[PDB]
Scaffold this active site. Structure first.
Site, PDB file in Angstrom:
ATOM      1  NE  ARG A 100     -49.362 -47.563 -41.929  1.00 48.12           N
ATOM      2  CZ  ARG A 100     -48.823 -47.490 -43.138  1.00 48.12           C
ATOM      3  NH1 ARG A 100     -49.508 -47.819 -44.220  1.00 48.12           N
ATOM      4  NH2 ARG A 100     -47.567 -47.076 -43.264  1.00 48.12           N
ATOM      5  NE  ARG A 155     -52.070 -48.474 -47.299  1.00 45.90           N
ATOM      6  CZ  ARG A 155     -51.952 -49.388 -48.249  1.00 45.90           C
ATOM      7  NH1 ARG A 155     -53.003 -50.041 -48.714  1.00 45.90           N
ATOM      8  NH2 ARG A 155     -50.748 -49.659 -48.743  1.00 45.90           N
ATOM      9  CE  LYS A 201     -49.824 -47.326 -51.074  1.00 44.02           C
ATOM     10  NZ  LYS A 201     -48.797 -46.810 -50.141  1.00 44.02           N
ATOM     11  CE  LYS A 231     -52.685 -43.668 -49.628  1.00 39.88           C
ATOM     12  NZ  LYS A 231     -52.056 -44.024 -48.335  1.00 39.88           N
ATOM     13  CB  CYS A 290     -43.145 -38.490 -44.513  1.00 36.56           C
ATOM     14  SG  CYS A 290     -41.579 -38.144 -45.330  1.00 36.56           S
ATOM     15  CB  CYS A 344     -39.039 -44.303 -44.775  1.00 38.10           C
ATOM     16  SG  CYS A 344     -40.039 -44.459 -46.254  1.00 38.10           S
ATOM     17  CB  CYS A 359     -40.231 -40.175 -50.227  1.00 41.47           C
ATOM     18  SG  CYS A 359     -40.099 -41.656 -51.215  1.00 41.47           S
ATOM     19  CB  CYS A 386     -45.467 -40.334 -46.970  1.00 38.90           C
ATOM     20  SG  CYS A 386     -45.596 -41.888 -47.864  1.00 38.90           S
TER      21      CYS A 386
END
Ligand code: SRM
Ligand SMILES: Cc1cc2nc3c(=O)[nH]c(=O)nc-3n(C[C@H](O)[C@H](O)[C@H](O)COP(=O)(O)OP(=O)(O)OC[C@H]3O[C@@H](n4cnc5c(N)ncnc54)[C@H](O)[C@@H]3O)c2cc1C
Ligand SMILES: Cc1cc2nc3c(=O)[nH]c(=O)nc-3n(C[C@H](O)[C@H](O)[C@H](O)COP(=O)(O)O)c2cc1C
Ligand code: SF4
Ligand SMILES: [K+]
Lengths: 518, 570
Positions: B83, B153, B215, B217, B434, B440, B479, B483
């Site tokens: 990424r 992020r 994380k 963001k 996602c 994934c 999930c 996401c």
């Protein structure tokens, strides 16, 4: 008078055993020694020397006779004065090289002045008549399986337990892991042995061949001492997946086809034709209304295929594992396949009927000392005996170091038994593993390149008394790996190419450089 | 003192294994360089498996063939997910050509996967190509540093404001924020770019030795567009302008959508309004908020570490006071901002600079060469022809920005022929999912490979109900992590098991309301039956310009979530 037997599978061994028998019955003296236990550097002190040899992948002698063959080519061979020689060589016309080992042995023995009492003669797969007619003339011009009931003729009727592909879906090659349950028969084997598997031809291929000759398929044919229908014979007793030059020129002679007659008399063109097309496609190019008897006479008896055992009885008990590389190729869009490999891959159901036996190979074994380092080079389907070696060494808790060289086109697809190797290096059983993926980058990289890269470590291990094992392809891999070993030895031993070759021959003599190639 | 937030500033307990890994990694170095040189396994062993995320790569295997390879005596097909760090989503055409070439050549899937955080992703990168991708990223002026694991992020910016004149300032500030919060470590350059080691230790004045608890963001919002979904991320800088020029920002802290199935201690809450900050204090405020989260985070629990949990534990007032003290500023009262919608503006859009912006709808953000639909080849030809730069959108769409009038016809001709902007229903344009399967590792149900057929069925359903011109924000995740941001859509489908989802309703058109769970563990046919009944109800008794979430809340079929920390599950 001494008889020399140079055999790996053992067809020359029985001939030499029968030869020594009637020599000791008739003359006296005559001692029989294999090429592996022959003091070949004392050749000049011989009175009569008879050599019975075989032929491996391309002309090379059996691995126990390679040391003697390299001695005769080393320019250090002594000049012979009081010995007479006769060479008997076995082979198979299906392969490219037909008894070239015997030809080379005879030519050199003549060049060093040996007395050729009997001219060299060639033997095909049917060596009974030739050997019987040769031993009588040898005698005339000279007077001044351990215990198991199962063998090639009576194979053990075992069962197929597991038939699992061990290559990814994106792999151009189909490699199977075949687990065969020996049952309570008590068949015993050792790492480095081979599992001779009797197979049967594809019923679809047999039917296509039969209807391609405008036959029915049930007309009686004579096989051995019994009468069996044509399909039964072509499926159980005759070879269809291998094309030979003899088959081609016999078809031309008994067919007189315009597209086959000009090829008669050209060995190169005939051999190229045999190697490029199967029997069924070759007869597709020219149907000729051939009857059942002509088809039976044209073909050759079906023979079992040997596969290196990928398991140790110290771990799997009453099972034998073989890594079967399935031969799959397409001719004009028609998917053809090999006989035994495709038989094991497709034509046997789970718990199916598979007739097997053990082909013992004494000259491919782990060191008797557990502390001896072991170096293994097993790219491709040559990884099976090294899997057996690893299982045997892990079972015995051998403290010796182990080095594996593996090679294949793709890492993510062609890494055979990858999880097993990861586990083995996790527990320290496999000290070092070197991998060469030829189709992962722009430049082809093979195992020999890794041997060249690790020359210093290889030399240190060899000085530590390590054993070098090579298993895999013999046409290219074996020669390339031998050259890489010679280069490493010459570079890191402070000696030239000839001394490197002598060192490798010595390693062969001390049962430290052993090959199981095909 | 409010009893809602009685927790301490810092929780005391046994530290998680991730914090130990960060501490003992020697500033994100580990043994990644050594682990790159082994051929026995296709992945990274030990702590490197998580340390490589700090450098932007996720170790992954194909889950479609995982069991097949397991029984084939083969290790899982370990391949890396690269990424890239693209602040604001703006990527130059030269960089696009480079990444297109790399994806075509040195990637298993041969695809560029645009994400909802305005950046692309490389899937199926072998370990031997793990270093060349970073080398080429540096060659074209990009990097993948600190786009995974526990740092800031990718920073988002509205990729197509209606008055496309503030985008320059907003993108400049997004890039400045992204560069400010980057780790001040030389591990990334030493490992990939091959820079000589300096005989000294690193400092990390911004993130610390152990970095952030989870994380982080950040977004830059230009109203009334909300395509970046500022309520799904921690820091949001809602741009405010007077006389057509940027004058300040609005700070909204406490975003997050990830939940855990059946865990009441995990919830998805919308960001809380902090206050207005002058334009010159943006970097100081971002530093203060990031450092406050770093200090007050929950490092003992990894399902309690995000800034939303810290906000609900320590209280909004104490967090704001600490941010003000750390930044040495005072938060002015919030100037009013409004949101009109959340979707993209597909087609040709005129800019102030006499340039046309072409937003291409790419289904699921997957750029590939499909039969009769060569999206990748058409995009490459556009990049060869285009003289501006590409803007990845937060809806996994690509914007061909700064097209002149003369080249408008040529760009339209190449794009239309390549199937980049073929006809698509309005509902499909506001439908997102996602990545999920087959890549994934945490995926429970299908989202990316399930979205096209599901939206086909839903479009047929709307056509049957005569509402096909209207659209519903419909997001599917395989999930509970959300996401695909299913926890902000009007209709959200969070995965629970292969083929089973949880249907969430009561969302918002502008994405400022979590959708409450309606029915759980229901297969696709049950979802279509329920949605058929609800769309039939909506298509008749709705008001003028009423969304589906607003109707569902108003009709009483579902109840909205007001405070998600208390009544999301109740
Ligand atoms: C690609 C993307 C979804 C998409 O289709 O666009 C995505 C994909 C993944 N996310 Fe995400 N996340 C993506 C946006 C999000 C967002 C939404 C957003 O940012 O707008 C969230 C929900 C909002 C939030 O969390 O605040 C999100 C919350 C997570 C979480 C849950 C974090 C948590 O708080 O618990 C995980 C799991 C984890 O962190 O270990 C996760 C994990 C992942 C991983 C890396 C799976 C993993 O842990 O190995 C995914 C890789 C999939 C693959 O095979 O390639 N992803 N993920 C987004 C890429 C963002 C980017 O490029 O920077
Ligand atoms: C000691 C020993 C150990 C062995 N160990 C193993 C082992 O571990 N694993 C293993 O897989 N094998 C091993 N082999 C080889 C095995 O015995 C067989 O030779 C092999 O499995 C192929 O058997 P087959 O009968 O299916 O092939 P065959 O049917 O006998 O051969 C197929 C024929 O088609 C030809 N052909 C091939 N490709 C093409 C093409 N593209 N176009 C036209 N013609 C083509 C070939 O030249 C050949 O004549 C070993 C052999 C020996 C002697
Ligand atoms: C892998 C392999 C390669 C062979 N290559 C040849 C060859 O090139 N020329 C030839 O005449 N025979 C070749 N043969 C046939 C052998 O020479 C034949 O089996 C011989 O009789 C060996 O029997 P023995 O081991 O009992 O001595 C080959 C056999 C095998 C298994
Ligand atoms: S929501 Fe779950 S399945 Fe979907 S991308 Fe995130 S982690 Fe993967
Ligand atoms: K989209």
């Amino acid at each position: 008078i001494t008889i020399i037997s140079a055999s790996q599978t053992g067809n020359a061994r029985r001939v030499a055993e029968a030869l020594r028998d009637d020599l000791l019955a008739a003359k006296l003296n005559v001692k029989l020694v294999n090429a592996g236990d022959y003091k070949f550097k004392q050749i000049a002190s011989e009175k009569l020397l008879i050599v019975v040899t075989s032929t491996q992948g391309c002309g090379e002698p059996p691995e126990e006779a390679v040391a003697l063959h390299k001695f005769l080519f080393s320019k250090k061979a002594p000049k012979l004065e009081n010995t007479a020689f006769a060479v008997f060589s076995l082979g198979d016309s299906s392969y490219e090289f037909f008894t070239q080992s015997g030809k080379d042995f005879d030519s050199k023995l003549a060049e060093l002045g040996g007395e050729r009492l009997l001219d060299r003669v060639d033997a095909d797969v049917e060596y009974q008549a030739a050997a019987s007619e040769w031993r009588a003339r040898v005698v005339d011009a000279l007077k001044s399986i351990h215990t198991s009931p199962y063998s090639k003729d009576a194979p053990l009727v075992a069962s197929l337990s597991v038939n699992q592909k061990i290559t990814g879906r994106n792999s151009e090659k189909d490699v199977r892991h075949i687990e065969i349950d020996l049952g309570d028969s008590g068949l015993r084997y050792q790492p480095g042995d081979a599992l001779g598997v009797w197979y049967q031809n594809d019923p679809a291929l047999v039917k296509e061949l039969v209807e391609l000759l405008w036959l029915k398929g049930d007309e009686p044919v004579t096989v051995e001492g019994k009468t069996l229908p044509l399909n039964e014979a072509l499926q159980w007793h005759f070879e269809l997946t291998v094309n030979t030059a003899n088959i081609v020129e016999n078809y031309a002679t008994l067919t007189r086809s315009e597209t086959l007659l000009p090829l008669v008399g050209d060995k190169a063109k005939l051999q190229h034709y045999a190697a490029t097309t199967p029997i069924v496609d070759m007869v597709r190019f020219s149907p000729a209304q051939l009857d059942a008897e002509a088809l039976i006479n044209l073909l050759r008896p079906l023979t079992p295929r040997l596969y290196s055992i990928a398991s140790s009885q110290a771990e799997v008990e009453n099972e034998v594992h073989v890594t079967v590389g399935v031969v799959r190729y397409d001719v004009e869009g028609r998917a053809r396949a090999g006989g035994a490999s495709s038989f094991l891959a497709d034509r046997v159901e789970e718990e199916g009927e598979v007739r097997v036996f053990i082909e013992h190979n004494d000259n491919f074994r782990l060191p008797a000392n557990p502390e001896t380092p072991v170096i293994m080079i097993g790219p491709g389907t040559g990884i099976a005996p090294f899997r057996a070696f690893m299982q045997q060494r892990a079972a015995d808790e051998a403290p010796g170091k182990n080095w594996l060289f593996f090679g294949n086109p793709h890492f993510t697809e062609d890494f055979l038994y990858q999880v097993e190797w990861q586990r083995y290096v996790k527990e320290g059983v496999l000290t070092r593993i070197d991998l060469a993926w030829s189709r992962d980058q722009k430049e082809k990289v093979y195992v020999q390149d890794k041997l060249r890269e690790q020359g210093a470590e290889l030399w240190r291990w060899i000085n530590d008394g390590a054993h070098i094992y090579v298993s895999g392809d013999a046409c290219r891999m074996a020669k390339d790996v031998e050259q890489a070993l010679l280069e490493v030895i010459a570079e890191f031993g402070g000696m030239d190419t000839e001394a490197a070759d002598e060192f490798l021959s010595e390693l062969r003599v001390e049962r430290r450089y052993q090959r199981d190639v095909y | 003192m409010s009893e809602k937030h009685p927790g301490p500033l810092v929780v005391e307990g046994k530290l998680t294994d991730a914090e130990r890994m960060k501490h003992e990694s020697n500033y994100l170095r580990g043994t990644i360089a050594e682990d790159l040189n082994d051929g026995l396994t296709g992945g990274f062993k030990g702590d490197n498996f998580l340390l490589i995320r700090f450098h932007g790569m996720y170790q992954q295997d194909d889950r479609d063939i995982r069991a097949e390879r397991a029984e084939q005596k083969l290790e899982p097909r370990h391949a890396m997910l690269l990424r890239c760090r693209l602040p604001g989503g703006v990527i130059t055409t030269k960089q696009w050509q480079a990444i297109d070439k790399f994806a075509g050549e040195n990637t298993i899937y041969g695809s560029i996967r645009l994400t909802n955080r305005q950046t692309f992703q490389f899937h199926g990168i072998l370990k031997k190509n793990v270093k060349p991708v970073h080398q080429m990223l540096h060659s074209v002026g990009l990097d993948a540093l600190a786009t995974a694991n526990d740092m800031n992020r990718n920073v988002l910016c509205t990729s197509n404001p209606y008055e496309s004149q503030l985008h320059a300032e907003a993108y400049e500030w997004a890039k400045k924020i992204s560069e400010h919060l980057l780790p001040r470590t030389r591990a990334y350059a030493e490992i990939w770019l091959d820079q000589e080691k300096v005989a000294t230790t690193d400092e990390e004045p911004i993130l610390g030795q152990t970095y952030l608890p989870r994380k982080f963001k950040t977004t830059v919002v230009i109203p009334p567009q909300n395509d970046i979904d500022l309520h799904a991320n921690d820091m949001n800088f809602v741009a405010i302008a007077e006389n057509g020029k940027l004058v300040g920002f609005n700070l909204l802290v406490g975003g997050g959508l990830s939940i855990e199935h059946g865990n009441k201690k995990t919830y998805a809450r919308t960001a809380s309004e902090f206050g207005y900050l002058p334009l010159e204090h943006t970097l100081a405020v971002a530093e203060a908020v990031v450092t406050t989260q770093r200090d007050w985070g929950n490092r003992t629990d990894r399902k309690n570490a995000k800034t939303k949990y810290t906000l609900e534990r320590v209280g909004v007032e104490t967090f704001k006071a600490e941010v003000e003290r750390r930044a040495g500023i005072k938060f002015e009262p919030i100037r009013p901002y409004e949101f009109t919608g959340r979707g993209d503006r597909i087609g040709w859009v005129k800019g102030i600079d006499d340039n046309w912006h072409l937003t291409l709808f790419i289904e699921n953000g997957r750029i590939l060469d499909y039969p009769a639909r060569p999206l990748k080849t058409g995009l490459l030809e556009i990049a060869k022809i285009h003289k501006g730069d590409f803007r990845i959108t937060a809806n996994q769409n690509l914007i061909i920005a700064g097209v002149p009038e003369s080249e408008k016809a040529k760009i339209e001709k190449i794009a239309k022929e390549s199937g980049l902007m073929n006809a698509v229903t309005p509902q499909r344009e506001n439908s997102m999912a996602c990545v999920s399967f087959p890549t994934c590792p945490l995926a429970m149900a299908e989202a990316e490979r399930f979205l096209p057929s599901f939206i086909d069925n839903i479009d047929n359903l709307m056509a049957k109900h005569g509402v096909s011109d209207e659209h519903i924000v419909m997001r599917v995740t395989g999930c509970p992590n959300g996401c695909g941001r299913a926890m902000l859509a009007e209709v959200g489908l969070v995965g629970k098991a292969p083929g089973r989802y949880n249907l969430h309703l009561g969302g918002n058109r502008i994405g400022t309301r979590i959708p409450r769970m309606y029915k759980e563990n229901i297969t696709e046919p049950e979802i279509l039956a329920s949605l058929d009944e609800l769309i039939g109800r909506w298509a008749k008794e709705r008001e003028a310009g009423e969304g589906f979430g607003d109707f569902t809340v108003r009709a009483g079929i579902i109840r909205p979530v007001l405070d998600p920390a208390r009544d999301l599950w109740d």
